[PDB]
Amino acid sequence: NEIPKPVAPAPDILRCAYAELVVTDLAKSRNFYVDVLGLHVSYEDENQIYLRSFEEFIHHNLVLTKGPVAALKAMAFRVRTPEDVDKAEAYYQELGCRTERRKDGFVKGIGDALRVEDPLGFPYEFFFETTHVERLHMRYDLYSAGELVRLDHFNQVTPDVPRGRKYLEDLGFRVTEDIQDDEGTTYAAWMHRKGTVHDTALTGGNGPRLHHVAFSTHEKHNIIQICDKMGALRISDRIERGPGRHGVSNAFYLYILDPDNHRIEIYTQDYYTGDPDNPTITWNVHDNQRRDWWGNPVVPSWYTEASKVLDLDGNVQEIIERTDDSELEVTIGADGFSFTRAGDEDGSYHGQASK
């Protein structure tokens, strides 16, 4: 059942670059991503909105495409050279995956691009060529109190984390942190190319589903302001979880829900991982500071809800149920538990979440 390593060389992946999300009401989505969140328009028409963060120079970090069923259509990684698109094609072909190459791109402002149904059922895109736009990094006349400054990562729900981890490691992603138990189950892994804690991450669950797309801010007060704004707009019900400090990654975070329930994380101030012997951190699944360092409870919807993903024909990918133990069940379910201090019943929670 393992995914064999191709003999063909892996493409040299720089970073996560953009996501294409199918949305059902383009105007409602535009209000969320432009008016609430302040992303910058790179192109729009009656069918699509192309958006970028404050410090981006490539054409976009987010494409909103009107469609009948809300879903992730592609999660796109930029590769180092044009020849790396050829490498990506040969690599996935050797893996036995369905691939589609468009020499003029799938979306505006991207050139030669390869989309694939990857071995975990996810629609990945690889591209080098992209239309450069004005880098807005010093446009403080446009800067919002909640400004989103970079695209940081994706998070994928998949049933077998070790299987997916090994596949991503072969593609050159390096694991930085993970969550395990003493019995040897892996519940989640984080992995990177660009020298932050992650470009993508695997959350154990029924999949393929897209858990979230994450944008960063400069400072913690910028995340606070997003929350404050949502309260002023009386859409606080769309704040799912946070704001908090993560255990894994050490980042300050917030999770919010778009009009189609696509989950967006806002994230800041993780650490440098670019050294090849970067120390890998393993948390125990029962540690109540692993996800929220302050011990705040993880709402069940965070574990159970995630976005559909599409195949290359635009149809929804069938889901495979996780057979490994469930993080939700072992921590906050009827027979779950967590601790503040390992071995101490004081500050422990049994069959219950924290707080």
Added chain:
Amino acid sequence: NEIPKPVAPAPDILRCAYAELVVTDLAKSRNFYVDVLGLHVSYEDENQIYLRSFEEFIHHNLVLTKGPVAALKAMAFRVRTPEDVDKAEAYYQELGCRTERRKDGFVKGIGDALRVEDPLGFPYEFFFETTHVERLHMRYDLYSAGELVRLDHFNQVTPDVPRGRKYLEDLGFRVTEDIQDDEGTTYAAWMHRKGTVHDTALTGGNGPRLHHVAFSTHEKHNIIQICDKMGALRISDRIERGPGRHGVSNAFYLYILDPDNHRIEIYTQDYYTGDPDNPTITWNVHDNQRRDWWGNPVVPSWYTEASKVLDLDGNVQEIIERTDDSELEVTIGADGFSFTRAGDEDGSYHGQASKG
């Protein structure tokens, strides 16, 4: 039932000044307030620790007094003149309250002071005279990433909020914000002298009990650091609620628990209330943004748990039960309700707390 307005003039109260808290293990409490929270020691011996915030010049903002039963011993307000302590004494005597006056103070660093058992059963102190100490407001060589800069307010649990409110208004406190419902019930009120949202507040519940004492920080990141530090110390279980943004008050906040479960709020960035026609804001009790503006749920312990208070002899005040509706029950209990948008079923909660 109503508390009459005295003929005697009310004392001119400046602000909340300090609390004296009884604690059971002086060493454990010191470690919390000094090592974890960073408050500054004005004086300490084997029985008491006198602590002050970064910007304070009066002797202290907090006195920890070792004793057998953890409780509030005195909540103190400073008055404008020495003659206002005379006014306070005559005022509470007309109210028929027990009073006790000491020209040399009850605690170190306070001179002529009046303590009273007020009409709600709380131990109030009024004083003018205090020993000035080094104001540490520019001692950035001492400044902590979580620095507590000022004492901001107290919050009192009392069963009948309107009764208490009228009494505090006659005493010169002005109501800035409150929480009511559509059936004539008041659940909470905030009231001030110094021109911030409050110097004290009333929370409807069984009482007298002390809900919390609140200290300010300069910035929101200072509150975040307190949380981060508690995680590093592996004492995140002592974070009760927050961090968040309040609806009422608009302040950024955090609630933590000391070793005797006394609740401390960290608070920043409320607004100016010093004009006498300052607009009074009333929230509906079912508005899920009233306590946490982001809609985060209020944990039941925040409603049910609070500190004992002492009388002037040092004995615990008997608790009188609230008969008015319970904010817990009407918002997050089995028959509770809250809304995100008034009149919208979407984003409303029936018989449970927000966010799952």
Added chain:
Amino acid sequence: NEIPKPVAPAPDILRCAYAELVVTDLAKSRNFYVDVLGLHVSYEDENQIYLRSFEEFIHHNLVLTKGPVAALKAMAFRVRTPEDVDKAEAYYQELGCRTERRKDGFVKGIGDALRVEDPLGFPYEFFFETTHVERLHMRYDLYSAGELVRLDHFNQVTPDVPRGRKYLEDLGFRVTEDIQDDEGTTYAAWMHRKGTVHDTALTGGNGPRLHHVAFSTHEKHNIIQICDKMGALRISDRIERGPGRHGVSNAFYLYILDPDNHRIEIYTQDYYTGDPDNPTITWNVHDNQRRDWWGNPVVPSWYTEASKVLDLDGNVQEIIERTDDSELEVTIGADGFSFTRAGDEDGSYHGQASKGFKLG
């Protein structure tokens, strides 16, 4: 030349409330205060713009009034009761000052108001009645990265600081901080009613002139953002001084210049002064951490330039020259001196400013 204490009781002043500035080009001024700084419009027409801060509930904190000569037309203080406007009139009449009373106000959204040519030549207004507006304190859908949240203070240039200080003390302002030297000269004083470091302040120099109006932010990053935005708009030449940490007041600060060179300070995180025995802090004029705690030099324009003020007829008040020693001259001038550490030659400056600079 002491100003006597009246027998008539002083009005009970709450706080500074608004300033009326005469501006020469209303559109250019609106661009600065609304588009650059983010203040909120309460009312406007062809002649005036009425602006308020994020947390204000009275009608306005600033009125911009088109006129031929840019100047301060009124610094306004709110009093506690309607009766305090009568008290103000009686008080200033006893002081021998010219006064003008308008039962329906001088500017929109203010009711019964008294304006006075005060003993230092400044146009003060006292009022209680004002039209309440929507308080925007939780309108985070409007909140700017540089949001101005309150009006904090005024600062006045006057030739004789002790004379003015005594008069303001009789009026009920308490001095929180001052700058003096060891030879009896007062260079500046800060004084309050509302329980912050100040509602107004006196800066020694030729006057009457208005030094600045100050607005506060929530946090230091908000002030940084104003600077950053001015850079992006390529108007960094309108940043006069800062950003910095003050010694006096301990506030984080920035000084900028509007289209008519009216100086605006942005300010945050001073301390509580409401207790009646609040300790008064006196800094020595030669302490190089007194104005900028980090030792950064005070640009000469900060000491020399300030706005004209008008009398009740709208004519510019004549300027009276300061004869006391000049803060500029004694610190950064040719015979000037400043220290980092009292009594240490190392980190001291002789005949020049700090950090490697001299007067242009």
Added chain:
Amino acid sequence: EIPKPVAPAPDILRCAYAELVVTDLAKSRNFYVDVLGLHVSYEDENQIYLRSFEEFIHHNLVLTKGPVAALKAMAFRVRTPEDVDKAEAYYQELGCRTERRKDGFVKGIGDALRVEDPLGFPYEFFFETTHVERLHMRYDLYSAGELVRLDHFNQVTPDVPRGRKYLEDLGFRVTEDIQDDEGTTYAAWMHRKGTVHDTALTGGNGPRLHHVAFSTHEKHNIIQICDKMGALRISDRIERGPGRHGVSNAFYLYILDPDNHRIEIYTQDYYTGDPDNPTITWNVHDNQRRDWWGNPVVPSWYTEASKVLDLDGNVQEIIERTDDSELEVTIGADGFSFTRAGDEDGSYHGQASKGFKLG
């Protein structure tokens, strides 16, 4: 011209640490540990080894007691052990003096190569290093001014294009630079790790070390360092700032250690890891290029820098810049700068911005 070797360049990850010679170890310890809050990895009577809050390698700064304060080595970590062999072959082909120590020059570094590079600078290349407790979640230690990473070095060298070409051959990519309309280069910034820079060249007499830079999380952390220095009554050791840079867009501060070694505190520059990352060239007369808010650049910033040592520990001879001086063309008596290109309003002629002339 410095030729491109046939031998492959070592794969450089990032700047890693500097070794600074200091004259009074206790006074230097007070500055770096007590004032700035850096974390001790090792110390004795001869040296102090210091790391930032988020570091896992042994150290980011070695303070070595010696007779003459100077930079002794600026060290870059390479990707594999074999890259140290590549460094050695590369610099030997360049004709540079090299010294190889299989067990390191300083504690907590293993196999290492030091070289006197073509610009006169003592560079070290290493892979092997002793891992230590990564303190990134130790909020019980976190100070209000916490220094979280080593970010970069800045080198003073007389001929910027000559140095830039050599660094490009070594794999560094230019992100930003400062030039004039007549083709003079005043400064260039260049990176390996995907930030604006790992090292930078400032036109001037050299070799000299301009500064070492550490990062903070947020801008308020830099403000606190200034506030703390005021409280300690050492504001005279704040040289320049705080400010926002034009070049790099980072929030910054420059301070001076007890031997006048300049330390920058820096935060919130941008991502440069894509290979077609857009370069940005600023005009030397643009008064927003160094401080975005137009604050004047203090003359000492342009004239003063640290000595550097050769592999024997002797001070490297200084070679004079012959290209135009940035100080002179901008803030000297014949200099000029502008706020808006072509606008006399907001321009400065023969003095610095904001009303000052040179002291």
